[PDB]
Ligand binder design. Structure first.
Ligand SMILES: O=C(NCCCN1CCCC1)c1cc(-c2ccccc2N2CCN(CCc3ccc(Cl)c(Cl)c3)CC2)nc2n[nH]cc12
Ligand SMILES: C[S@@+](CC[C@H](N)C(=O)[O-])C[C@H]1O[C@@H](n2cnc3c(N)ncnc32)[C@H](O)[C@@H]1O
Ligand SMILES: [Zn+2]
Ligand SMILES: [Zn+2]
Ligand SMILES: [Zn+2]
Length: 429
């Protein structure tokens, strides 16, 4: 196993990770190399397929022209995994579209055939031992898994010997329960991976650890002091939202209800759903209605970004904020979500001024709603800093870049390449 830690039976939480020694804020508890991993399609050409290094001048795979590498070594090392997609991409052509979940599951199957023995990524929890929640699956989820199984057979039958359908619904449910997405310093999606020992950790809305990535390596660092005997908890979800919203997401994606201090006390719920203080305050029924509206526009926008124009997307943000502002304060998390979505539309449109004015309204409430060390508030400071720097506002930029570094030093470690990059950005301008 891992030094200073141990696997244990967490009452009402199945298996978990327990500390056998003290850990201070910013200490690295452990690292876990990716068992299986996949670079997201939209990041091809930007990062090396094998090690996830973000570099200019990456070598293109001559066969498929859709895999990029640091050099010939990264290329040869990725071939046992790349071989699953190389020829299929050119033969299926435009028809090649398996979901990221399917791309990852294919590599797990390939890894199980090549390396059946326990890997260095499985010191405490093995891939085969993963929780699946098979018995909890409803018709909607079973249908989704069946769509994934059909795509797995459709695109990856060349090198893989598949187990029966029942073993594959168990596998896909394990991947849903235990899979990780890898994000960059701005929380932008890079890919998906399997980190078995990292999947041992249970959830808390007040976590004592944070997971970050150093290429394909997962790193676990304390964001609170951890004493011997204490369970080590990470957050599975976005902690901006009130208790009900967090537990709806936790029940839906992870089949459990959280009972952490935050969910029990609901301390942050009041400010998260802050109401405008006005002559004749809004009635309880007016609040519940606005909240119902808010959750519906979130869903509406999520669907809309796939097919609506950037001006239509901003229109939804601006109009929903207008309707909500009659009842809701600007610091209210539903206003924040729409402002964050509007900021993203500006960034894509390269409207740096527009992005900056949204970010400026988001950062103070973010700090108030998120825990002391948070990747979401670090990433927002970083975005804000780069916007200021880009728009020639160097003093405001250096200040925001340093605010981001202060959180990142705890979460990513002092020596993290993302911090060396940000420091080079402070140096240059
Ligand atoms: O890293 C992520 N979250 C942080 C905490 C992760 N840790 C890791 C150990 C504990 C928590 C994260 C991972 C994934 C991810 C990565 C790989 C494969 C499938 C992934 N997804 C899983 C969720 N699924 C949603 C719908 C669903 C749910 C259950 C079922 Cl059964 C079905 Cl059918 C469909 C979609 C696929 N995705 C994500 N999205 N947002 C966030 C996501
Ligand atoms: C990635 S696994 C974590 C390790 C898991 N406990 C095991 O024994 O394999 C995620 C699953 O653990 C359970 N879990 C995690 N955090 C929990 C919590 N705070 N309360 C209850 N169950 C939790 C849920 O069943 C969830 O789907
Ligand atoms: Zn590389
Ligand atoms: Zn290729
Ligand atoms: Zn909680």
């Amino acid at each position: 196993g891992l030094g200073g830690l141990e696997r244990f039976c967490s009452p009402g939480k199945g298996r978990g990770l327990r500390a056998l020694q003290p850990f201070q804020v910013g200490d690295l508890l452990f690292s876990c190399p990716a068992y299986a991993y996949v670079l997201t399609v939209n990041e091809r050409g930007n990062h090396c397929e094998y090690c996830f290094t973000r570099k200019e001048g990456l070598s293109k795979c001559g066969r498929c022209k859709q895999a990029f590498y640091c050099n010939v070594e990264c290329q040869k090392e990725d071939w046992p995994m790349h071989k699953l997609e190389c020829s299929p991409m050119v033969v299926f052509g435009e028809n090649w579209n398996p979901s990221e979940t399917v791309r990852l599951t294919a590599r797990i199957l390939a890894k199980q055939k090549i390396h059946p023995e326990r890997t260095p990524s499985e010191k405490l929890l093995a891939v085969k031992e993963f929780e699946s929640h098979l018995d909890k699956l409803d018709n909607e989820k079973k249908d989704l898994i069946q769509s994934d199984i059909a795509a797995l057979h459709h695109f990856y039958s060349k090198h893989l010997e598949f187990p029966d359908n029942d073993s594959l619904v168990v596998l896909f449910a394990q991947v849903n329960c235990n899979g990780f997405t890898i994000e960059d310093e701005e929380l932008s999606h890079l890919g998906s991976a399997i980190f078995p020992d990292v999947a041992l950790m249970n959830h808390s809305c007040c976590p004592n650890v944070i997971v970050t990535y150093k290429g394909t390596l997962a790193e676990v660092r304390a964001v609170q002091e951890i004493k011997p005997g204490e369970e080590v908890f990470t957050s599975y979800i976005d902690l901006l939202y009130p208790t009900e919203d967090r537990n709806d997401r936790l029940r839906d994606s992870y089949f459990f209800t959280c009972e952490c201090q935050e969910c029990t006390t609901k301390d942050k719920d009041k400010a998260k759903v802050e109401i405008r203080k006005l002559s004749d305050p809004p009635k309880a029924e007016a609040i519940r209605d606005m909240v119902r509206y808010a959750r519906n526009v979130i869903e509406e926008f999520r669907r809309a970004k796939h097919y609506k124009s950037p001006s239509e997307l901003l229109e939804i943000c601006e109009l929903s904020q207008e309707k909500m502002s009659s009842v809701f304060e600007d610091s209210n998390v539903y206003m924040l979500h729409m402002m964050y979505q509007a900021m993203g539309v500006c960034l894509y449109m390269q409207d740096w001024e527009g992005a900056l004015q949204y970010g400026q309204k988001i950062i103070k409430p973010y700090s108030k709603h998120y825990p002391l060390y948070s990747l979401n508030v670090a990433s927002m400071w970083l975005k804000l800093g780069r916007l200021y720097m880009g728009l020639e506002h160097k003093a405001a930029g250096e200040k925001a870049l340093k605010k981001a570094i202060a959180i990142m030093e705890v979460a990513h470690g002092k020596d993290h390449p993302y911090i060396s990059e940000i420091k080079q950005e402070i140096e240059s301008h």
